[PDB]
Design a protein around this ligand. Sequence first.
Ligand code: HEC
Ligand code: HEC
Ligand code: HEM
Lengths: 294, 108, 108
Amino acid sequence: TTPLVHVASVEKGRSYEDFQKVYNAIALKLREDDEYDNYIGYGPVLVRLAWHTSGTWDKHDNTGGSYGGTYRFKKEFNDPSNAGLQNGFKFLEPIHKEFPWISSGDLFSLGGVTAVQEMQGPKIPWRAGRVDTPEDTTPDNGRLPDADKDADYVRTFFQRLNMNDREVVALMGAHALGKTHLKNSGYEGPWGAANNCFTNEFYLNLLNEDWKLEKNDANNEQWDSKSGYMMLPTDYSLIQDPKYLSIVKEYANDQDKFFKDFSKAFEKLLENGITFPKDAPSPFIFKTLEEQGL
Amino acid sequence: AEFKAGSAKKGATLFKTRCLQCHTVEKGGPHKVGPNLHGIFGRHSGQAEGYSYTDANIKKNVLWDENNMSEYLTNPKKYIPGTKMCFGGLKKEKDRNDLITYLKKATE
Amino acid sequence: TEFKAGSAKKGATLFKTRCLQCHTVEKGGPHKVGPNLHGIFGRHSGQAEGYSYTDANIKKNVLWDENNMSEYLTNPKKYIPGTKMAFGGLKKEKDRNDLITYLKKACE
Ligand code: HEC
Ligand code: HEC
Ligand code: HEM
């Protein structure tokens, strides 16, 4: 008859205590398997995983998005845009086996929320209820952003995710986490030095480092600084565009502000495409391990 | 925390894998993301000449020794709230002892 | 000259790749973010017609010769602080040679 709607349905009897148990499981494994990627740990790749699985959404026909958890299928799993994400998938496998009742999309998104919180970032309210959909619902590759582009490209790309200037700049601050790996994306290097702590370092480095546009070993160009950091062409476009620059500057000078906006934008990202019943529960705000005397 | 002598070799590996990213240990070595650590034991926190410390680190005004260093490395932000050093900490005593045994030697 | 002179096929792609988004060189060519660059060389900075220049580009009034032009491209904001041209600069002499040479020829 007409267009797709995805209704949030949380499994019977499953509530906040259940999901907090899953959060804890991820947070614990994040601490136990700490050697990954030269001790950066799996936090950054989990955040990138939550973003890539949600970022396939197209607001115009409601295809893609985190709802269906389709990254588990071949086509999306092998999207070149997802090179390296297999690591986050493997990290979460045992977790899913311990908690078989949680949906795939619910697990991928919760993984990003847990990683952000456990890396001392802002609390990200989260809502359960994503439901696995058949392989046929797997979007084709090509929906994630190219990093070799400019501000106009970034702005129009994010319009497809219903994101505005503020939301775009805030979400990009996640690049404070982890690093680019030449074998994965054709780009190499960290955006900063505090790779596994969620801060506003991305904006600070963008504004305070001396950047030089250079070719890397994969023959792509990236902006490099003397400190050994890098910025993708799309990251640097945030100080090339005037509108974006003003927001970069305000986050560079106010982390609490960045945190609040990032929290709102990341949850929105994670919930795009999802219709939540009006009688559905208020979003959950999980306690960190630290907050549990753990 | 109470330091107990350990393995300098294993401590060297811990340092290389967990600290070198941001710190050098040789005398006259350069500051990097973090302060060069030569002469760290016996000096007060935030006194490395030429490095821009956080306000919190300097105010801790801790005269570094093997014991409070062990306490610090167990949970940096906990011991010095607001420090900008990004590091969750070495939770195992054995790990902290091997590392400090090495640091005592490498810096000395 | 003090500035050498290079390949103009290279300069061409460098210009198409790094300057084209904002500037034309053809005669009559339309201003974009940047002024039409036709007959740049031999003119004073800030003269293109019916293009609005930051007072900074006007008040510097320098004749554009392949030499002051190369100092400029290395770092547009150091050269004409306040300029609004959003370019990081060409850190490579060949590039600068290669480009200028191209320009020399394209903006005749
Ligand atoms: C990602 C960065 C990074 C890593 C990894 C890191 N540090 Fe630090 N460290 C810093 C920074 C930055 C400071 C400055 C703290 C401040 O000013 O708040 C610092 C400060 C310290 C201090 C206090 C120095 C003084 O003079 O007061 C000690 C001691 C220290 N680090 C030891 C180590 C050891 C040992 C390790 C590893 C087990 C380590 N650091 C890992 C960045 C790092
Ligand atoms: C993103 C925008 C942008 C880019 C990239 C760019 N330009 Fe500019 N250019 C401008 C603007 C805007 C101005 C005027 C600046 C002002 O008024 O301060 C300008 C001014 C100039 C001027 C001075 C014009 C005059 O009449 O004095 C020259 C010469 C020039 N650009 C050449 C170049 C070259 C060569 C490149 C690339 C290698 C380049 N531009 C890249 C936008 C750009
Ligand atoms: C213009 C949009 C974006 C582009 C082009 C982009 C591009 C990239 C690329 C090229 C990498 C390196 C991958 C690798 O080589 O391992 C990466 C990593 C990462 N991105 Fe982005 N990104 C974008 C938006 C985002 C957003 C919105 C988030 C999350 C909110 C995000 C989170 C991450 C994380 C945390 C990593 C580090 C992964 C790791 O260390 O394994 N990115 N991104």
